[PDB]
Amino acid sequence: LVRYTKKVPQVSTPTL
Q: Which experimental technique did the depositors report for determining this structure?
A: NMR
How far is Cα of residue 2 from the mean position of the Cα atoms in its chain? 8
d(C-alpha 14, C-alpha 8), whole Å: 12
- For residue 8, count other CB atoms closer than 10 A to its CB: 9
User: In angstroms, rounded to a whole number, what is the distance separating the alpha carbons of residues 14 and 3?
Assistant: 8
CB 14 within 8 A of CB 4: yes
Q: Which amino acid is at 5?
A: T
What Rg do the C-alpha atoms of the chain give, in angstroms?
Answer: 6
Q: Checking phi first, is residue 11 left (phi over 0); if not, alpha (psi -120 to 50) or beta? A: alpha
**C-alpha neighbours within 13 Å on the C-beta side of residue 11:** 0
